[PDB]
Amino acid sequence: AAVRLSVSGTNLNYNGHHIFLSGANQAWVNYARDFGHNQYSKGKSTFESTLSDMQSHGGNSVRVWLHIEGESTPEFDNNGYVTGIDNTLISDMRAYLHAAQRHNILIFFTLWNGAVKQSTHYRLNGLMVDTRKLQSYIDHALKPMANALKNEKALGGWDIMNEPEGEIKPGESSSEPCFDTRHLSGSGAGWAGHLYSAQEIGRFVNWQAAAIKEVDPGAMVTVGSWNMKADTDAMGFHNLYSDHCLVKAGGKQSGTLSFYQVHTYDWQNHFGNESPFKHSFSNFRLKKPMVIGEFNQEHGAGMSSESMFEWAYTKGYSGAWTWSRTDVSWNNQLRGMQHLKSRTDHGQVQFGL
């Protein structure tokens, strides 16, 4: 019953000591087909070699994508309700967690993806727009999974969705400021389709956050936001993921995030003024920790991998995960991680589980 990973204000702690999360996105081996149906055994050698590489270069965490759009897990009925999970999903996830533990690495599982709309999107769509379908997922898949895995020492936490803003409706006025998306006009938001209102996305996150914390009250929960324009109330923007916004959207008082996660990439070799690489954490007026959850040197406006990890570590952020084992240069990412290996000035990076 010892407390492992926790939050204090805008810092992350492990066994009561200040830590920093340093690592990478896997984010998959076989996209949407890595766990359940005896699929882990198929990718085990890649997952294990990635863990070995990371341990030797001082990384302490990996982000991995789980359901995505419901291609292989969980199990759906013909009307889009969730009926359960297959009988090797949990045991596959546990085997991976045991491998991670042997290498002192924490795993963060990402449930859904909003950045692309493919042929099984209707499965995720139902859970987004129909609250009774969402509840079936919570009851028959999410709670069983979170309850079964909560005592695994290598379980870092849960990310509800990658980039929900891929499918948001921009340019919408609202009487509630946090649901107003006029500031996202011209931003690129809604690239996969103008499908969901800000309130619909907020409800989706609020309900799943509450569910995880009902069965694992000490769990870390986040959302991977595509851009700071949707993740701060400073600079003329609005934060879709604040406690106030999520509770207004879905009504569950416990359905709040543990920490924020933001992605950042340059455009024509420059970062926009909203980027966390152009400001200190304190500029954004947030009351939870923030992890920079996707970035890389290839889209880093001339910054080295080392400089990007250094900025995150020293300017008030609580983690940095490069994108990704599958994409761009893996050696660049490992060299970045290695820069922080022995560091303790802004939290421990090498700590035992």
UniProtKB/Swiss-Prot annotation:
SUPFAM superfamilies documented for this protein: (Trans)glycosidases
Mind telling me which residue stretches traverse the membrane in this protein? none
Indicate the enzyme's highest-level EC class.
Answer: hydrolase
- Keywords, A to Z? Disulfide bond, Glycosidase, Hydrolase, Signal
Q: Known catalysed reaction(s)?
A: Random hydrolysis of (1->4)-beta-D-mannosidic linkages in mannans, galactomannans and glucomannans
Task: Cite the GO molecular-function annotations of the record.
Answer: mannan endo-1,4-beta-mannosidase activity
Which biological process, per GO, is one annotated for this protein? mannan catabolic process
Q: What is its EC number?
A: 3.2.1.78
Instruction: Briefly state the modifications made to the protein after translation.
Output: The disulfide bond between Cys-178 and Cys-245 has not been observed in X-ray crystallography. This may be a consequence of the X-ray radiation.
Family from the record: Belongs to the glycosyl hydrolase 5 (cellulase A) family.
Question: What is this protein for, i.e. what is its function?
Answer: Hydrolyzes 1,4-beta linked polysaccharide backbones of mannans. Hydrolyzes mannohexaose (M6) preferentially to mannotriose (M4) and less preferentially to mannotetraose (M3), mannopentaose (M5), and mannobiose (M2); hydrolyzes M5 preferentially to M2, and M3, and less preferentially to mannotetraose M4; hydrolyzes M4 preferentially to M3, and less preferentially to mannose (M1), plus very little M2. Does not hydrolyze mannobiose or mannotriose. Does not hydrolyze xlyan, starch, cellulose or galactose.
Assembly, per entry: Monomer.
Task: State the name under which the record lists this protein.
Answer: Mannan endo-1,4-beta-mannosidase
Q: State the organism named in the record.
A: Mytilus edulis (Blue mussel)
List the top taxonomic levels of the source: Eukaryota, Metazoa, Spiralia, Lophotrochozoa, Mollusca
